[PDB]
């Protein structure tokens, strides 16, 4: 599908509300495998299970190992811009 830009809003007491799988060391994109109901990704409306996370706040995640992606994603705060695509 088309590449989309998605805005997520989160407070500092919460996580993103997603589960991710994959990573460069597995030859697979960083994929959203779960969206936890009521948490920031669900509330933002624009992220879905099966989306590939291509970038977050301008940081490219297309060539990123799993734990690299976890550190990068968990460091973002507040108003967070995602670049995603559903394949």
């Amino acid at each position: 599908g088309p590449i989309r830009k998605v805005l997520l809003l989160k407070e500092d007491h919460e996580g993103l509300g997603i589960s991710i799988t994959g990573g460069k060391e597995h030859g697979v994109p960083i994929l959203i495998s779960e969206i936890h109901p009521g948490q920031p990704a669900d509330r933002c409306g624009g992220l879905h299970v099966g989306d590939a996370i291509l970038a977050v706040n301008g940081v490219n995640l297309r060539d990123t190992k799993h734990k690299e992606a976890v550190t990068i994603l968990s460091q973002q705060r507040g108003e967070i811009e995602f670049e995603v695509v559903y394949v």
């Binding site: 589960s19 991710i20 994959g22 990573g23 597995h26 779960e34 799993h66 734990k67 976890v70 994603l73």
Partner: peptide, 8 residues
């Protein structure tokens, strides 16, 4: 089982 999953 080969792919990792992290809750974030």
């Amino acid at each position: 089982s080969r792919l990792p999953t992290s809750k974030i």
